[PDB]
Amino acid sequence: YKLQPLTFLLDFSVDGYIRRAIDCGFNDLSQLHCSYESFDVESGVYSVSSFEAKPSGSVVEQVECDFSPLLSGTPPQVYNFKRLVFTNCNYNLTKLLSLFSVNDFTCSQISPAAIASNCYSSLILDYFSYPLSMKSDLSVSSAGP
Amino acid sequence: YKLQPLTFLLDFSVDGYIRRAIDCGFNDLSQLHCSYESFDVESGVYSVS
Amino acid sequence: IAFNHPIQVDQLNSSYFKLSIPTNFSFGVTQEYIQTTIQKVTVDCKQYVCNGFQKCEQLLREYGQFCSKINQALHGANLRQDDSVRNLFASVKSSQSSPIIPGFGGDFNLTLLEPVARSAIEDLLFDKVTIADPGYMQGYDDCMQQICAQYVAGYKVLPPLMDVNMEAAYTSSLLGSIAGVGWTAGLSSFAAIPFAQSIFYRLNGVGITQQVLSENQKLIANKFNQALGAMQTGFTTTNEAFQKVQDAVNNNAQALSKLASELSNTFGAISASIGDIIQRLDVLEQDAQIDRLINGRLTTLNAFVAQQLVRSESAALSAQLAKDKVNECV
Amino acid sequence: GRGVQNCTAVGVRQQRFVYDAYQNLVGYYSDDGNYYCLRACVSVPVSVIYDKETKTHATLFGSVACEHISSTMSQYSRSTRSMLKPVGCVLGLVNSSLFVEDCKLPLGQSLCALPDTPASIAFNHPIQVDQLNSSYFKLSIPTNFSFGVTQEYIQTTIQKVTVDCKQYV
Amino acid sequence: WTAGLSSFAAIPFAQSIFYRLNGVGITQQVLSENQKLIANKFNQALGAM
Amino acid sequence: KAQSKRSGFCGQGHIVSFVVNAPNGLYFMHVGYSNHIEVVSAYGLCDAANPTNCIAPVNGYFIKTNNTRIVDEWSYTGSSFYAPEPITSLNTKYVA
Hints:
Chain E: This is Spike protein S2'. This is part of a larger assembly, with 6 copies of chain A. By secondary structure, the first copy, chain A, is an alpha+beta fold. Chain A has helices at residues 28-36, 68-71, 93-99, 112-117; strands at residues 9-12, 18-22, 44-52, 82-87, 122-127. Chain A has a two-stranded antiparallel sheet. The interface between C and D is large, with 54 and 43 residues.
């Protein structure tokens, strides 16, 4: 029999061995017994977790914006930070990741897998030249100059 | 007309375009209208800043 | 000036004293509402919290014992309300009743016979008041066609436990009882029972009328029926007593809805209903934001339970006062 | 989000998404240019009626269509709990042994709507004394004294206790 | 005796106290006449309060 | 203290009341007064003489003047009462 994490109230006798237990999840009565923490509960009308609908058929509505200016030409210095605004355009972040090896990837209050999965209203891609060594100096929040 | 950050009570019609707006900052009565989220407020004595 | 000046009389040195004599019966007056009971609401834990997501529910299991205690407290408050309602209806077990007459009053255009089931006066009060709390395969169905209680899963309404039509039949029995119970005869007697006139016994008690004046009072009784009709027309919000009935209905609906909106909405700006629901693919990042959000939802729910317990206790005292009025005034 | 259509035109139409004084959005214009209102995900409430003496449990569904609900419904992830556990919809679908089985029983299960459930229906059994239309009296006198009645507790006072702060912590 | 409404109007305060005392207790108007300085004793009670 | 029977807050029935000690509180033993038999009664009578049959306590009753009992037990009072009658109502020969 396979084992999975569960909450069980265990009856212990004078010997202390477990002779009785309640699953607390399989049946409404077991959930009710776990709530009151008693093997016997007084007769009453008790609410139990309600049924929920099952998610299916996610609907996503789809023009591929060019990323050539970002990877072409001279990147300006970090003070002259350069960004391209993108709206109503399909994106290929995987192609950009394959094109340039990523020394460090950090996301603040967001996840890289999550951004790829979900559409964004607007996306800004920034390309600029800054020293690789001073990773700490440049950050969303830092005391670095 | 210079734009400034300003709390505003906005009413949107069936078309969805705003046709009625109230400025909370200007006028004690207008600030009272922003309270209760109602363009019209029942007559009462109300404290103001 | 708001001063209205009470009526005044002059003290006399002589033993004989000036007296004031009424000339108008002016029968009929609007009356206050005792509140009596609060709407019964049961909150389903583990559904509103975590928005039915299994990963959040695993985190919720650590706080599961607190959630079970919240459910037990709500069940206890509803049970107390049911006990109060049955005690209030017990006063209707008295062995006094009058068979209903379509022509209950010979010259009385009374609004008490059910149209044919909710006497007109009860129906009029129900029509003006609006309550969205109770839905039975109607509001829930209408939302699908487009209440939201089941869809949000924040709270579930509980029915009153007494049929309104059955209670209306009990009030009709009470209408028969008033004339019979209010009689010189001890214990229970039908008595004259003439449309609650109670013969001249009620008339002598209200004022020391003469027998010749009693014939004039019968003519005044037709005027009293017209005055009762004016009271039925005066069901406007301007009347404070009607406004009090509306306020109680508004209070029960507003309390559950406002707290439910706090329980399910933006909540913490970072929380956004479910912490990192689409913001972070990683389970750990979502869990940390969710744990802070869950604690906030639980604290607001605890405040809701405390408010309901205070309301139920106040309702029980109000119901006892309503029972007291049935014991003496009725 | 999980949501369920065709609805009357609402909103400026410049923005496909629309909101109703809430963070949740009614959406619309999801595909091409047609109104597509979004409704909150369907949830079916379930309650359990349990009698300790008979050890019998009945699943109860409130304010939901009897036809829409089914035993072990595939559409809903859990019918009630991990495992499950069709009377007419007076209050809703109740999956209980037998049918309404209406009987003259006053109460004892305190069901949400009105069933005695010893789904039996309660009977008022009112006591009525006939009154003649012509002036008359109908005095009612008890056959037996029936002296003595049980009385409720008045509470009176609560236990007095004190805690020494800074020593308990 | 205001059995119904304020139609009864007013009665002398001293006489009303005597009539109410006669109803409340076996002390009677004849007994009150026999009693001496009953009003003075009532004044002393007010002074004590 | 005393029998009430008017606006009674006692046990929904009042004859006698008792008080008993309770833990952290007080307890009561109220007494209340079976199936009731309904008797048709004429609504008063007017005698040729100035005194007329009238309803003052339970009273009522039909032929043979007053045949009523204030107590639950039947025939508690033979018919003693008499007294002057203040006025005679319509439908003479009967207070009806």
